Design a protein around this ligand. Structure first.
Ligand SMILES: [Mg+2]
Ligand SMILES: [Mg+2]
Ligand SMILES: [Mg+2]
Ligand SMILES: [Mg+2]
Ligand SMILES: [Mg+2]
Ligand SMILES: [Mg+2]
Length: 150
RNA sequence: UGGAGAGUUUGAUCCUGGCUCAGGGUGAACGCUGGCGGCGUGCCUAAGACAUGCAAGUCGUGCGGGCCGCGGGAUUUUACUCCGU
């Protein structure tokens, strides 16, 4: 069992002959706070089945978060559409200084000291997606070494 | 040792994009309120106009006087004159 926080719920709507037709979208993170997180986007006729559905997709979509005591190996910037995130390593004592969206994601990978900036489009969905791509993109001294040995 | 963002264009969406808020600051002023103290601080406007008092003197160990005193002398005649203070 991982942890699970709901970042976002929204109600969307389509049109049909006489009246609009509502739907709900749910952004949910799940994490063991020990270097494993997942993002999930779940949509349904009702909030619950949606949230719940998110949960399910979150766990099916997971990342190696190579913590190095509270923080991440190095800096990364990732663009996702018009959304951009910068992630920066911090010495212990700082905290997760981030916006609600990536805070949630960082916290549940058990990151505790990180400096972030949201740049470009601040649309939650894409910020969240960038954050994940960013983490998914972190290497460590080891991995680099492996890559370059040959 | 250092970096958080949110609201608002649509029936809904993504994006551009402006407006707006959350923080910090001030020689402040204004409203309601107002107990004590220490340390700071107080014409940002007319370099407009200014009553009155005070804000730059001191040296008699550089010099000679004037005015008000006091005291000594010369003459034994009282006026005149010398010295000290
Ligand atoms: Mg771009
Ligand atoms: Mg923008
Ligand atoms: Mg409006
Ligand atoms: Mg329009
Ligand atoms: Mg509307
Ligand atoms: Mg905007």
């Amino acid at each position: 069992d991982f942890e699970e926080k709901m970042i976002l719920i929204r109600r969307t709507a389509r049109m049909q002959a006489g009246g609009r037709r509502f739907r709900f979208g749910a952004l949910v993170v799940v994490g063991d706070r020990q270097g494993r997180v997942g993002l999930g986007f779940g949509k349904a006729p009702e909030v619950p089945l949606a949230v719940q559905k998110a949960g399910y997709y979150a766990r099916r979509n997971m990342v190696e978060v190579p913590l190095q005591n509270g923080t991440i190996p190095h800096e990364i910037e990732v663009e996702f559409g018009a959304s951009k995130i910068v992630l920066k390593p911090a010495a212990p004592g700082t905290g997760v200084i981030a916006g609600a969206v990536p805070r949630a994601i960082l916290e549940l990978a058990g990151v505790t000291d990180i400096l972030t900036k949201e740049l470009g489009s601040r649309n939650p969905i894409n910020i969240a997606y960038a954050t994940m791509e960013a983490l998914r993109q972190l290497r460590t001294k080891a991995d680099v070494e492996r890559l370059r040995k040959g």
